[PDB]
Amino acid sequence: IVGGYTCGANTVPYQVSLNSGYHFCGGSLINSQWVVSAAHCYKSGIQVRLGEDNINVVEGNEQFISASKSIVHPSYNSETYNNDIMLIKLKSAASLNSRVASISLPTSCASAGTQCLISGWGNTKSSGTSYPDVLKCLKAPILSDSSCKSASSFIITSNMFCAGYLEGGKDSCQGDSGGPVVCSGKLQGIVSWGSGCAQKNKPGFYTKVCNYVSWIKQTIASN
Numbered sequence: 001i002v003g004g005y006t007c008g009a010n011t012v013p014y015q016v017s018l019n020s021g022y023h024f025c026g027g028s029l030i031n032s033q034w035v036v037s038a039a040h041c042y043k044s045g046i047q048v049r050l051g052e053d054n055i056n057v058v059e060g061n062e063q064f065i066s067a068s069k070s071i072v073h074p075s076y077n078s079e080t081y082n083n084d085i086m087l088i089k090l091k092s093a094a095s096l097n098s099r100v101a102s103i104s105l106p107t108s109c110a111s112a113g114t115q116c117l118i119s120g121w122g123n124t125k126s127s128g129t130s131y132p133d134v135l136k137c138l139k140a141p142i143l144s145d146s147s148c149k150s151a152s153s154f155i156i157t158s159n160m161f162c163a164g165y166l167e168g169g170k171d172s173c174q175g176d177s178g179g180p181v182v183c184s185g186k187l188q189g190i191v192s193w194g195s196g197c198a199q200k201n202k203p204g205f206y207t208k209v210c211n212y213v214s215w216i217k218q219t220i221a222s223n
């Protein structure tokens, strides 16, 4: 997260870090045994870390649980980025409290101009690089489809939406992926991609969770 702020210890209790020996992607907890993330974040043998703040220091409210299974969406196309969503099942349920809590799926898609909360432990730097210890946060507006389409030369599909600021400066970044975009207390987005980070006329792009609510529920129920 570039141009953002330190969220505060456990203020975003649905934020989850996916760890493969090190932090590498975030997710969102949708219920006590299911985490939503990005399909491009798939890795075998993931450990999912709940109640994290400082990912480098053991602070007392962490829960480390192993991914039972990681279910990439069937039409995820690693090359085009379309359907960049995945569900991770945990081997055991997380124990839910004030610092570990699930986020609601949307009932309808969020409208352009909605202010949302984006968070993660990804790059915070303007130009050059730096990864924070504690969780970063960003409030950013969903931009319009016609604004997003003109903003890129990669092919945008109807399973993506863009959010952030056209002037650059404020954006999700590398290591944020798979993390949440929450709008009006609903999980509307998954950090998916962007052309660099916080660059002018290059806003962040997000999996449009609202198109996948049925697939999520059916998947959770079948497994």
Ligand SMILES: N=C(N)c1cccc(-c2nocc2C(=O)Nc2ccc(-c3ccccc3S(N)(=O)=O)cc2)c1
Residues within 6 Å of the ligand: 078, 079, 080, 081, 154, 155, 156, 171, 172, 173, 174, 175, 176, 177, 191, 192, 193, 194, 195, 196, 197, 198, 203, 204, 205
């Ligand atoms: N700016 C962001 N919000 C953001 C978020 C996560 C990662 C990165 C990022 N930080 O550094 C690079 C990044 C990146 O995503 N590069 C990138 C650009 C385009 C695509 C892509 C998009 C649509 C279609 C096809 C492609 S692809 N696979 O052909 O390149 C994939 C990755 C930036």
Ligand SMILES: [Ca+2]
Residues within 6 Å of the ligand: 052, 053, 054, 055, 056, 057, 058, 059, 060, 062
């Ligand atoms: Ca910690």
